[PDB]
Amino acid sequence: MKVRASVKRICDKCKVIRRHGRVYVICENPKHKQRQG
Amino acid sequence: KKVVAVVKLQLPAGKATPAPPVGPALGQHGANIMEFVKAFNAATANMGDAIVPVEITIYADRSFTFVTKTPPASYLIRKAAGLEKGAHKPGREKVGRITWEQVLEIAKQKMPDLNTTDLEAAARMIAGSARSMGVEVVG
Amino acid sequence: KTKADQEKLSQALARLAEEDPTFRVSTHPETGQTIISGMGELHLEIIVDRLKREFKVDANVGKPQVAYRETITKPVDVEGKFIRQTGGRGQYGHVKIKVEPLPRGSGFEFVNAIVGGVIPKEYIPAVQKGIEEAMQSGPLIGFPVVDIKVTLYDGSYHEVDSSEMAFKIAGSMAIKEAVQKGDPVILEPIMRVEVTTPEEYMGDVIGDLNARRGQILGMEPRGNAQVIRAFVPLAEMFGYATDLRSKTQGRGSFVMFFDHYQEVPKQVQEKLIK
Amino acid sequence: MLMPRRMKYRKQQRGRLKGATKGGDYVAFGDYGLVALEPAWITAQQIEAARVAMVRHFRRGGKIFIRIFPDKPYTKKPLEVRMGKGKGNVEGYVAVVKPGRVMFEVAGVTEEQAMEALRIAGHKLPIKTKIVRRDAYDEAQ
Amino acid sequence: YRLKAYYREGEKPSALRRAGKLPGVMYNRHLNRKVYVDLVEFDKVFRQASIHHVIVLELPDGQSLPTLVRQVNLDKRRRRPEHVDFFVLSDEPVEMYVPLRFVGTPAGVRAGGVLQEIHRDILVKVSPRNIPEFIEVDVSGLEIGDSLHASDLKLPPGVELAVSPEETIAAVVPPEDVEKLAEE
RNA sequence: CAAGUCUGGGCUAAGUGGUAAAGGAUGUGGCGCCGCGAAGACAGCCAGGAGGUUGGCUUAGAAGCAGCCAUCCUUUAAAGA
């Protein structure tokens, strides 16, 4: 679930980061590793 | 020369064969896999059925030990109402029932296991298991 | 490949069977294709070199087919008429039957439901060999339409026109259509298999088996290991060897037996329509 | 789909969407509703696509009330054809929806479910919407 | 209940909304004064109170009349009560809407369906003295099928319905079940 | 490029400004209602965190933790079927 236009919380362990003006969302499962775009 | 144990099996009544999980855990016990079907079913030759929990503990020389508890609370309540199965959907469907004394008779059967030392408290632990399996209390 | 190689192969095993009696060659007793009995991937594999080189034979390597079966769900009753009355040897045959699906593994049952005898005695045998017959190519793929009970409960005749043959067709018609009408169902083969595996590997072993169109049936230990039993579709059961020895690094073994036939998941109904 | 049964006119003029709603701007039936914020033309399909997933989400749920009813013939000339030659033929239908209009509302369900099915419905819809409850909808005769 | 209200001179009834307060007007067969009340406290009260229970309004003139919201107009595009109608109750019996209390689980309640509150507010009448409340309606013996209506209800020591009777008060209807298709 | 790098208060931190949509976001300021508060609260440490009981039904097996329901009791300082 990397690049995309709608990044959301795929499980509470997920966290909404925003480093460098880019909204990222990280969790324990590399699957959830998102990032907007 | 296998090692030690606080084995917490869960073996029923009667069916005493070395077959697992009485094998892999009790092969490092040296367990008299036949001194149970006799020491057990002698005291449970009374009941006949219902599982009997058991904690077989081994030691150094290759000896064992094992303390058994009572049959599931859910059991004695299944017969004191002509049941076998609960009621599938507790609450709505009453399939049978137990009076205020029949409750106070079973709680005798398991009073030295729970924690309370009464019956007004014991009985309740029975009476709670009544809606756990869909069987009201005759009151 | 082309029927040419089909021969080089015949010699291929006629000498390769003696030069290695750890295998067996079998021609599917119903449908040409020949199986290569091995004992491990490699086994059959290296033969595919010798058998393809030192024999120059060059053929195809897919997997077996499955002995499917036709039947229906709903029971039906249709007419069996035949009649061709134009001017002489009339050909007059007609009957009505009662078709009814039976437990997968019921077989073949007919019914002489004819009262007094509206359908003359001499012809019944013929109306069965007709019905019996038809049941060969299914209404769906062309397979042994079975597990059914048939009820001849009516039908007439003509004194002069009728024919032993005329009836065989009429009956072969009522059959050839009751199946079409009572909603067909593609039955298939289920196997019994028992994998001996150290409950070490077991964990996935069961998995794997579940993800194989199969449903578990038990596991009563054996040796130091543990057995698992269950049913499975031969289709999603092929080359299970190199899959059991995968989940088990070697410590695994299984058997397999046929048992019954049974309906396909519909999604697999229209799959087979080719 | 859904649509008129009869009709005096097979074809009808466009017109243009203004504010307001004229009516149907309140509950009156269910417990929870969905309402339009932006005006538009919703096709039968759009409606159905939602109504569906509406019920789909809540297997065994209550009753949904379609408070909207297309009746406006959707025109469109044939493709690769110039102007003139009369009007166009019907393609489908649509119900002219304006802001403040209660599109559907459900009745008899947990808040959890209702507040969610509608969240989805709104995705099927081409316009943004609000999800209302029932407070001051009392008396709207 | 209470509610702080004030007199309006009658100047820019829209200046008031912007202003922050909600333009009103109360009356009755005798007197009608144009008024206005703050939202917050009218939300927070009408939010509950509504049109079932009176609201005693207090004006800077000591009076503290008892009234019912006989009407609440809206802002349609965004619903925002834009003007109320306080009926100054009296002593004379007048009609109002009393709430219905469906007191008894029907059969649809284990079977299924959903109770349909086809008319949770009815129009009766009674002197403001007797300010009834939940008019209990009897249910139980009802299962997804027909229903009951008319005036089959406990009419209090002075309440005296002003509807028909006959109006289908409420009925239970069949739930939706995902897997269901009829087309074919 | 002719006339305020004018004055007071406020927002914006992308060069947004310097042109676009649904839909995403602990952006960032601002108004609000409504809770816990020193017989010790938020983050916080070490602690305990249990027994009836693997609840009942179902299943291959369901033991707090597929999924139906159901949610009583208990010994307590406290522990959810």
XYZ file of C-alpha atoms in Angstrom, chain E:
184
model
C -38.114 24.703 31.384
C -37.109 28.361 30.827
C -35.668 30.438 28.130
C -34.442 33.970 28.049
C -36.355 35.924 25.452
C -36.639 39.568 24.570
C -38.750 41.901 22.608
C -37.847 42.818 19.114
C -38.533 46.364 17.833
C -38.987 44.900 14.448
C -35.867 45.940 12.713
C -33.936 43.834 10.350
C -35.234 40.390 11.354
C -32.191 39.172 9.528
C -29.827 41.454 11.369
C -30.618 39.348 14.392
C -29.667 36.036 12.916
C -26.347 37.442 11.896
C -26.424 39.161 15.198
C -26.404 35.857 16.789
C -29.964 35.589 18.015
C -32.939 33.766 16.544
C -35.976 35.819 15.643
C -39.237 34.748 17.168
C -42.808 35.610 17.822
C -45.288 34.280 20.371
C -49.000 34.845 20.516
C -52.421 33.397 21.188
C -55.947 34.525 20.594
C -55.286 37.573 22.611
C -51.764 38.865 22.399
C -48.855 38.469 20.003
C -45.492 40.093 20.509
C -42.561 39.789 18.228
C -39.621 38.301 20.014
C -36.168 36.674 19.741
C -34.063 34.235 21.685
C -30.434 33.197 21.649
C -29.574 30.092 19.776
C -27.269 28.254 22.168
C -29.900 28.235 24.842
C -32.618 27.486 22.307
C -30.583 24.706 20.832
C -29.827 23.409 24.343
C -33.441 23.535 25.259
C -35.421 22.791 22.114
C -32.788 20.219 21.530
C -34.681 18.491 24.369
C -37.758 20.245 25.384
C -39.080 20.353 21.790
C -42.855 20.709 21.348
C -44.031 18.287 23.966
C -42.986 19.897 27.080
C -43.711 23.683 27.594
C -41.090 26.291 27.728
C -41.664 29.147 30.120
C -40.167 32.251 28.584
C -38.965 35.052 30.688
C -38.889 38.532 29.396
C -37.321 41.567 30.897
C -40.854 42.387 32.026
C -41.174 39.874 34.787
C -43.635 37.855 32.842
C -42.672 34.329 32.408
C -45.212 32.828 30.036
C -45.528 29.134 29.240
C -45.537 28.224 25.538
C -45.182 25.484 22.997
C -43.246 25.688 19.736
C -46.136 25.488 17.449
C -43.897 25.934 14.478
C -40.302 26.001 13.572
C -39.340 27.234 10.194
C -36.047 26.423 8.578
C -33.078 27.504 6.444
C -33.489 24.455 4.144
C -30.001 24.849 2.732
C -28.294 23.746 5.965
C -31.133 23.460 8.436
C -30.966 26.197 11.052
C -34.168 27.099 12.819
C -34.819 30.524 11.492
C -37.908 31.528 13.364
C -40.092 30.055 15.955
C -43.726 30.332 16.959
C -44.326 30.389 20.614
C -47.968 29.573 21.416
C -48.612 31.095 24.776
C -50.521 28.397 26.569
C -53.201 29.305 29.038
C -55.697 27.566 31.022
C -58.084 26.902 28.079
C -57.716 23.450 26.622
C -55.763 23.477 23.415
C -54.305 20.910 21.047
C -50.737 19.742 21.102
C -48.639 16.688 20.142
C -48.000 14.208 22.960
C -45.261 11.638 22.675
C -45.939 7.982 22.160
C -44.355 5.303 24.262
C -44.196 1.974 22.661
C -44.149 0.034 25.923
C -43.841 -3.648 25.061
C -41.582 -5.591 22.780
C -43.530 -7.072 19.963
C -42.914 -10.317 18.211
C -40.858 -8.706 15.481
C -38.406 -8.673 18.309
C -36.881 -12.097 17.998
C -38.525 -12.742 14.721
C -37.464 -9.632 12.856
C -38.716 -6.739 10.958
C -38.646 -3.278 12.313
C -41.132 -1.365 14.255
C -42.169 1.550 12.164
C -42.874 4.688 14.228
C -45.438 5.778 11.527
C -46.686 8.413 13.896
C -44.764 8.966 17.212
C -46.572 12.202 17.931
C -50.255 12.596 18.157
C -52.645 15.498 18.218
C -54.820 15.526 21.235
C -56.041 18.332 23.564
C -56.207 19.253 27.198
C -55.940 22.173 29.492
C -52.378 23.274 30.056
C -53.049 22.215 33.587
C -52.748 18.529 32.708
C -49.417 18.474 30.850
C -49.340 14.809 29.912
C -46.444 12.996 28.567
C -45.624 9.668 27.008
C -48.947 8.241 25.946
C -48.309 4.556 26.259
C -49.223 2.386 23.344
C -49.715 -1.307 23.807
C -47.670 -3.811 21.772
C -46.624 -7.468 22.216
C -48.907 -9.685 20.380
C -47.744 -8.331 16.949
C -45.609 -9.950 14.361
C -44.367 -8.786 10.970
C -47.617 -8.581 9.130
C -50.540 -6.185 9.830
C -50.519 -3.696 12.613
C -52.646 -1.546 14.832
C -53.830 2.002 14.622
C -57.012 4.015 15.425
C -57.125 5.210 18.996
C -56.223 2.031 20.815
C -54.541 3.911 23.599
C -54.674 4.889 27.205
C -56.327 8.253 27.150
C -55.348 10.000 30.466
C -57.761 11.621 33.002
C -58.609 14.390 30.586
C -56.768 13.895 27.401
C -59.155 13.543 24.456
C -57.630 12.788 21.025
C -58.253 15.107 18.078
C -57.041 13.017 15.088
C -59.532 10.613 13.545
C -59.070 7.739 14.848
C -58.211 5.487 12.056
C -54.762 6.818 11.105
C -52.333 3.940 10.931
C -50.233 4.680 13.977
C -47.540 2.097 13.447
C -46.668 -1.096 11.790
C -43.845 -3.621 11.491
C -42.198 -4.351 8.211
C -39.886 -7.047 6.815
C -36.048 -6.557 7.062
C -33.691 -6.562 4.193
C -31.745 -9.658 3.627
C -28.560 -9.396 1.553
C -28.864 -12.567 -0.230
C -32.172 -12.335 -1.960
C -32.819 -12.133 -5.728
C -36.088 -12.238 -7.682
C -35.357 -11.026 -11.208
C -34.743 -14.425 -12.722
